[PDB]
Write a protein that binds this ligand. Structure first.
Ligand code: OGA
Ligand code: FE2
Ligand code: ZN
Ligand code: ZN
Lengths: 483, 8, 6
């Protein structure tokens, strides 16, 4: 080959390969080339520097020179060609302004959000409304006592987080003003977070999942009521011993690397951070506990009208219009403070402002009581994706497979056991029976689609073997009913 | 369009 | 910065 084209880092022409891709950056001083992963830059920096000085230079040349902030109202704040374009919703200019009028956004009705003082009052109100099987409104619980939600004692902060997870642990982080996600070392984030006075750019990570860290996973957990209704938790129980063995004896075992891991997240964001409107992936529900700081959520109920506005909003090229302004007064304001907890059921559209540096623990989960709404959000996502192109990692992992597994391992078993007696399921398991029908119908559609345009882990043949068995037991039970 | 969002 | 991919 040719020497000039050898990476001055790993000293090779081809990198070994988080993921380098096949990308290089050149030093503006010595002109040698480095693979991105060999340059000493982290992904969040790939676009910041107008002049890059490699580590070999930079004692004798100085730090890399970053682009000038030419257009604070654009995601491309560094591009002169955009100076004259419109103010974009995520931008620094936009957020400054939005901060001065955000408190005019109206408060919710009692139909939309129920505020309660503690988990005991939450429990009573939750039950008045039909519980999880009929969960439709958001709850804000001022004091976590009664929720059975394991959390770290105050005094716990970002410092303990980086110590437990490790300095080099990489988290996907939001570059607020750019409205994009890049990788950043936990140590790098902490450094920027500590420099309270100098913040050219704001960062906010939402995506630090720690259910696989043996220390962290005991320090912050979902409320008990959530662990009890979580579909993922039902399928990959964290059991041991004979429970686990039986889990193996039945073919109910599932690979740890197949598990959707979205139930234990830590979030940390700088004051002035803004996350724009979205519905959480798979239409999952959310528990959200503020350890430190403050959050302002802007929320809209999951109605067909709101979804149509939202779907249009997401597929439109436009970037200058705040969803709240085209949503016909649907958007409501709810402030959440330190120690307080938000519980959001499937489908709620929401954005969030971070008025103050914050540390949050939360998680996403699916449950039978919101099965219909979850499927409705799946359709919404699928429609949006037909338009714009997105990345898999912003969606619910193994969404479809989870349902095959849940139908096979959970619901089929229950309808079969019911069927083997006279048991009319409507007596002690009406909810199980209605969930089965809803899931079945949605799965029929998935089969039909697969037979039309082929597959994309579970062979087509296996799926078909599950469906026939489900149809059978379902028909058996409805005869037991018509009787 | 859809990059600034929760990642798994 | 000046970049390339291969
Ligand atoms: O905290 C943030 O700024 C955004 N997070 C959410 O939208 C949520 O947790 O469901
Ligand atoms: Fe969210
Ligand atoms: Zn290299
Ligand atoms: Zn150099």
């Amino acid at each position: 080959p040719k020497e000039s084209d050898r990476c001055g880092g790993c000293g090779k022409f081809t990198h070994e390969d988080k993921k380098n891709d096949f990308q290089w950056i050149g030093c503006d001083s010595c002109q040698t080339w480095y693979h991105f992963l060999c340059s000493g830059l982290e992904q969040f920096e790939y676009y910041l520097y107008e002049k890059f000085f490699c580590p070999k230079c930079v004692p004798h040349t100085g730090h890399s020179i970053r682009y000038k902030v030419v257009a604070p109202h654009r995601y491309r704040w560094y591009s002169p060609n955009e100076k004259h374009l419109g103010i974009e919703v995520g931008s620094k200019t936009w957020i400054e302004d939005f901060i001065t009028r955000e408190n005019t956004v109206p408060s919710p009705t009692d139909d939309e959000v129920c505020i309660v003082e503690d988990g005991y009052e939450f429990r009573r109100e939750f039950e008045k409304l039909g519980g999880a099987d009929n969960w439709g409104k958001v709850f804000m619980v001022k004091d976590m006592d009664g929720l059975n939600m394991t959390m770290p004692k105050p005094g716990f902060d970002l410092e303990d987080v980086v110590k437990i997870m490790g300095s080099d642990y990489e988290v996907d982080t939001i570059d607020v003003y750019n409205q994009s996600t890049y990788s950043m070392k936990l140590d790098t984030f902490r450094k920027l977070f500590r420099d309270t006075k100098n913040r050219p750019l704001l960062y906010n990570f939402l995506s630090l999942e720690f259910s696989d860290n043996n220390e962290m996973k005991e320090i912050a957990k979902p409320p008990r009521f959530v662990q009890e209704i979580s579909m993922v938790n039902r399928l990959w129980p964290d059991v041991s011993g004979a429970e686990y063995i039986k889990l193996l004896q039945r073919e109910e075992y599932l690979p740890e690397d197949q598990r959707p891991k979205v139930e234990q997240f830590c979030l940390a964001g700088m004051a002035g951070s803004y996350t724009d409107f979205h519905v959480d992936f798979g239409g999952s529900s959310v528990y959200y506990h503020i350890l430190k700081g403050e959050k302002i959520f802007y929320i809209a109920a999951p109605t067909e009208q709101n979804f149509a506005a939202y779907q249009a909003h997401e597929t439109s090229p436009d970037t200058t219009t705040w969803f709240g302004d085209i949503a016909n007064g649907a958007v409501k304001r709810v402030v959440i403070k330190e120690g307080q907890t938000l519980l959001i059921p499937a489908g709620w559209i929401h954005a969030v402002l971070t008025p103050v540096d914050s540390l949050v623990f939360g998680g996403n989960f699916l449950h039978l009581g919101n099965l219909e709404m979850q499927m409705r959000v799946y359709h919404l996502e699928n429609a949006i994706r037909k338009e714009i192109r997105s990345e898999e990692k912003f969606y619910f992992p193994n969404f479809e497979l989870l349902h095959w597994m849940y139908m096979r391992n959970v619901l089929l078993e229950k309808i079969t056991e019911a069927n083997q007696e006279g048991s009319d399921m409507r007596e002690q398991e009406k909810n199980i029976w209605t969930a089965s029908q809803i899931m079945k119908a949605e799965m029929e559609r998935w089969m039909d689609r697969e037979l039309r345009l082929g597959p994309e882990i579970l062979p087509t043949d296996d799926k078909n073997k599950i469906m026939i068995s489900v149809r059978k037991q379902i028909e058996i039970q409805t005869k037991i009913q018509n009787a | 369009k859809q990059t600034a969002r929760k990642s798994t």
